[PDB]
């Protein structure tokens, strides 16, 4: 866009059903350098969520997973063999490098616009930034919806163009409890 008045107000419809992601994960500690990294995560995927209508059941339209090995006790035998019969849609992986790699690849494959998850800011998102700083996978910027000259350092601006949904905070909009940690 060039001139700030080529904006065209128009009031026909609601925007169409939009992709949403059922993202979650599970980190684990490391007494070695006193960090809490992660070796397994996943998400469910819905591919056109109605915004001005009722809820789409099934709760998804696809999903995936990814899992790496630790440095304290390594995998039990035949995980792919044991699971894919039961099939909660998990895929084997090798490195947390590979993990983030095919995570952003799953983005690339779907590219949603609303990231759903709880405990994000106080505990997790910054850890994702830490790990993308460490592993240094190419096309780092796909975590947002843009490419940037670099990944920046109150550090929420790093993620842009991608609705960072809430599950914890927004929960407290309506109902009261002792915990609102779900």
């Amino acid at each position: 866009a060039l001139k700030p008045d080529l904006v065209n107000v128009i009031k026909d419809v609601s925007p169409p059903p939009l992709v949403v992601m059922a993202f979650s994960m599970k980190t684990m500690q490391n007494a070695k350098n006193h960090q809490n990294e992660i070796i397994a995560m996943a998400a469910l995927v819905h591919h056109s969520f109605a915004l001005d209508k009722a809820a789409p059941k099934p709760p998804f339209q696809s999903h995936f997973c990814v899992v790496s090995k630790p440095k304290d006790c390594i995998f039990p035998y035949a995980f792919k063999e044991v699971i894919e019969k039961k099939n909660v849609k998990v895929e084997v992986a090798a490195t947390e490098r590979t993990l983030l790699g095919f995570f952003l690849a799953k983005v690339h494959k779907i590219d949603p616009d609303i990231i759903v998850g709880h405990n994000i800011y106080g505990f997790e998102l910054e850890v994702l930034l830490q790990r993308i700083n460490v592993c240094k996978a190419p096309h780092w910027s796909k975590i947002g919806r843009l490419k940037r000259s670099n990944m920046p350092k109150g550090e929420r601006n790093a993620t842009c163009g991608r609705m960072i949904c809430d599950v914890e905070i927004s929960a407290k909009e309506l109902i009261r409890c002792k915990s609102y940690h779900l």
Partner: peptide
């Protein structure tokens, strides 16, 4: 430079 509100854990 500046210190930290003591309950925003960040490595």
């Amino acid at each position: 430079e500046a210190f930290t509100p003591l309950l925003a854990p960040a490595q």
